[PDB]
Amino acid sequence: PGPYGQEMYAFRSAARFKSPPILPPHLLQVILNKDTNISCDPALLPEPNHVMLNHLYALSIKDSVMVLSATHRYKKKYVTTLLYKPI
Amino acid sequence: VKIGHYILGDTLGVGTFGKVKVGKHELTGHKVAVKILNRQKIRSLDVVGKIRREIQNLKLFRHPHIIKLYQVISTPSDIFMVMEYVSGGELFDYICKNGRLDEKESRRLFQQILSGVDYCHRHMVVHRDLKPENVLLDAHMNAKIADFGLSNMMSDGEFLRTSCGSPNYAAPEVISGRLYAGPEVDIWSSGVILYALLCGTLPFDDDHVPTLFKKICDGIFYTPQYLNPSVISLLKHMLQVDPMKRATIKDIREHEWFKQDLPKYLFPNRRIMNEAKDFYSPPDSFLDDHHLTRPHPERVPFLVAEAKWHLGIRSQSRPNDIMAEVCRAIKQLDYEWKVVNPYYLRVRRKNPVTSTYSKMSLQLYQVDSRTYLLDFRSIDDELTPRPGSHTIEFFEMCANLIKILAQ
Amino acid sequence: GKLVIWINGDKGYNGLAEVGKKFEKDTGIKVTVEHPDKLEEKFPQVAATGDGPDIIFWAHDRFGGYAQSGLLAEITPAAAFQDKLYPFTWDAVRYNGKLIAYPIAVEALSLIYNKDLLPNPPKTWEEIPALDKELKAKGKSALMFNLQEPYFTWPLIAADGGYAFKYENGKYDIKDVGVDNAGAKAGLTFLVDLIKNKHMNADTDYSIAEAAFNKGETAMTINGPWAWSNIDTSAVNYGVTVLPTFKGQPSKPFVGVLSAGINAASPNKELAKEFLENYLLTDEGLEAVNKDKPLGAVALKSYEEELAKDPRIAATMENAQKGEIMPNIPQMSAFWYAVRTAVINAASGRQTVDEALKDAQTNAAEF
Amino acid sequence: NNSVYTFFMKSHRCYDLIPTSSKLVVFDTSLQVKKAFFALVTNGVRAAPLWDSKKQSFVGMLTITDFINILHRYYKSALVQIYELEEHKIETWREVYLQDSFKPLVCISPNASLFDAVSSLIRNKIHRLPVIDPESGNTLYILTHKRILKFLKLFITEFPKPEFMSKSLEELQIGTYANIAMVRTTTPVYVALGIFVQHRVSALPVVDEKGRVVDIYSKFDVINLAAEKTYNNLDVSVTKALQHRSHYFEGVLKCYLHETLETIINRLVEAEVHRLVVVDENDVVKGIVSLSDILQALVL
Ligand SMILES: Nc1ncnc2c1ncn2[C@@H]1O[C@H](COP(=O)(O)OP(=O)(O)OP(=O)(O)O)[C@@H](O)[C@H]1O
Ligand SMILES: Nc1ncnc2c1ncn2[C@@H]1O[C@H](COP(=O)(O)OP(=O)(O)O)[C@@H](O)[C@H]1O
Ligand SMILES: Nc1ncnc2c1ncn2[C@@H]1O[C@H](COP(=O)(O)O)[C@@H](O)[C@H]1O
């Protein structure tokens, strides 16, 4: 229930001096940079936290292609989907 | 008041929203606790959904150490919630009356409590305010968790903005207005309760309110000779000011002190997967004395022949500047948006091949005074079985954005 | 800068606007009039905080619980004004020795009967199920009123010797609970025997009875001075006669008073509450009665001599003589909601008659 | 025989087969080959569902068989010809590859039974069977033979164990015993690759002068060429290519014809390999068994 003044054009700046939100340290904990166990499987991953799932974890673009991943939930199953898509 | 068979007794307390009393059955004399939410007083505020997200939740919950909602009855006078009533009263009056407790008792209770708050966390609810004055005891002197007015619902990929609760027992992160996950603030209030259950005194106490926040934000606290070092360790690691280094329900489960004298009726196809499929946590002791390991056959050339995943897009500039750039490029891409907050967007596209629509949310963050982060969050579709991939449509929308935003 | 006045849905906004036009022209400010549904719950939400509307139109009785809260405004009587304007109405609005409300209209319930069909109206409640037994051969019905509001249903329950409260003197016993007595048992049992014997439909609310009466589908309902303005659009030739007695003992209709209570505002003058309103009452009240609706029971003898020529007014009078004035105490509010729940639980089958009466006594004792 | 296994595979669905937390990748058709290939070693996964951006469907799969095919088919010399296949694309090799035959992408809902999954496996001779939910359209996991056989052997208990344990491997006649494709330890990789692409074989156990299996050459081993940047030279023998792990491997995993099928499947799920080369006291190689053959026997 928040009012917003103008949409097509920007009439004036916000009255509040500062409104930045600070990043919580739970999205800085990435699960792909975690080094899994040698003996189990390269395919598997340790169990992530329910919060950090829907957010997008982009790998740094190196050679003219994008490299992004996300952890999607299911009923009792988590999956991490990686896509490499050229520009 | 009387609805079916109960004549109210003595007023228990003032409660959060309205007062609470004790019913008494007219023929057998059963004692229930009835929560009276005055209609006028809650319709004044906007909290009418915040009660709903309690009523929805407490209809499902059944636990022997959690106070069980029986039924909620609504009538134009006021709202009534009927719950089990216990004779022993609140915890803080036993803390008061008994002073400091030994290990067997504090242990047993803390186990019962922790088991409750696990059971809650798993069903995707977090009740912010933990204190002895909100938790009761029965005739058998077990642990009962009563007050759930200040609870909330845990959504998928959604943090919490609202910080409330006791000033002593509020987490270090929430007092500075920071977004936070539900489990660690509960775990930290658990750990200060456990401290209270051993020494008798609060760990972070002061009259002056700014000094109290400074003492909470600092990790130092009193460590007596009253108890063994195992608990000292367990508290230092449980009451860490860093939420990244703060323990979880697992981390406490496999702790030495916790295991001792634990009846197993607290923690309960799933179990088939747990045992045989999983075999198909690194142990510190085994690594030191063993030099031989059996590597999986899919990995065996990689550790003979032998990548930093960023969070998202970071561009150091003014907040309004970058958000204007983004709102200009998403319009250049001919897609359409709405804003709730000036730094929050809910955007959606239409499938070119099918008539379906896909959505997502944008929330701008700050990693530090020099740099910001722009986050990309996916959503769910409630109803229709769509012959297309949510994840891929999401990734392609994000790609088509980031391409125009970089180049 | 704008005066919002919330009004009930049965009331007419145009009549209030006509009365307000004269004041409006002098002031130069225009008044908006809305009719929000369930105005019982919409006023004490904003009244506790002082938000929203300025003036509330509602019955006097549910102000005696608003006053006990401390929300309502305070006025002081004047010696030269109180005596001349009204002989006795002040008694009804005198809470704790201080006036809290402006008495506008002495009102009472009455029987509105068809003349062409059923030429003679009944005078007892004991021949109404026999008049329905006679009329269920022709395809008509005798009495079809709202069974959801207890304002209409009470004078049938309390007529057999069932009394919630005695006011012979100031003294009364809070411990004694009196609605499970014999009279109220026979009156609720007789209304459950009226529903079970298929004489009365147990699904008619205010809306159904109001649409069946505005179209002329029911010959009798106990509504009040509103619906006569809708009978003038209807072909049905009609009369207004005394409510029926019961075993010799007459029915006791409650005496409502439409009042206008100031809602909280950040500036409030003390003189405006009494001195300004008294002048308004003389003109606002007299004109409203003369223009649209004859209330017929006013405390000024000059315009009473003109209104006592209508025999419908003397029927309202002969009702209101045989009745009992309502106590202004706040617990009557906590009585009202009791009685409504007696009449919806016995009618829906959730509870029996004895259980409903026991529940009402427990509600009186335990709320 | 089929009284318990067929019932056990019809009553349980593919959903339960999927592990709890896993890492999966997908590829775009506009991507080049060599990029995705170099990526497949760094990510640790060998298979990926291909997604075409234009068609809005899953056009196919990318496994190490495709790698092998493109390496054999386009190979002229060992140092100066390697230009052409660097710049090659995934959709271009898709378009030229389906000149001979049109094999689309096959998928199964995870709510369907395991029996239908292993039915699709055999009937299309594919090792990599994705599961795609019909509602969400997302590709959860890629089912494999090895998972299904580990889940069959580990789950079974002595009270529901069948009476089929008693029969020995020999007498039952399971596997391919007639035409054993072999290579010598001095032969290069190229010929092994020829044999891979021309036949339907999944690996070759290499033999010495006598014919004793000293090592094996798998279709999965070839990615170490793309890992150590030794895919340029195919002239070297398979001993040079397997020299990297000569300090690491324990020995050749092998069984006999006189052992029981119980112990064979238990040493197969305990070594986590694709086959057990059956030998004799001589160590001459009579016949080769496969995981697919065992699954085919189990289903019927
Ligand atoms: N009979 C065998 N003797 C010796 N080594 C073997 C034998 N079978 C397999 N190996 C070794 O095991 C490793 C993996 O073989 P396998 O083909 O089972 O793995 P994979 O292809 O990753 O599994 P999957 O078939 O499930 O994809 C190979 O590098 C190979 O050297
Ligand atoms: N699901 C599938 N649908 C259609 N073709 C496939 C599928 N999976 C693999 N293929 C094709 O079959 C060939 C062999 O694949 P597969 O047997 O699954 O892997 P591998 O040969 O590595 O065990 C590959 O070249 C691939 O192009
Ligand atoms: N190295 C091999 N030599 C002979 N036949 C094989 C070989 N590998 C696999 N096969 C056969 O090919 C079929 C399926 O192969 P695969 O799915 O790759 O296990 C089986 O029925 C086997 O008989």
Ligand SMILES: OC[C@H]1O[C@H](O[C@H]2[C@H](O)[C@@H](O)[C@@H](O)O[C@@H]2CO)[C@H](O)[C@@H](O)[C@@H]1O
């Ligand atoms: O039925 C309960 C109700 O009765 C009276 O309400 C009357 C009101 O006085 C009239 O102005 C009009 O609105 O009809 C109402 C009944 O529907 C009491 O005044 C009120 O307190 C009580 O709730």
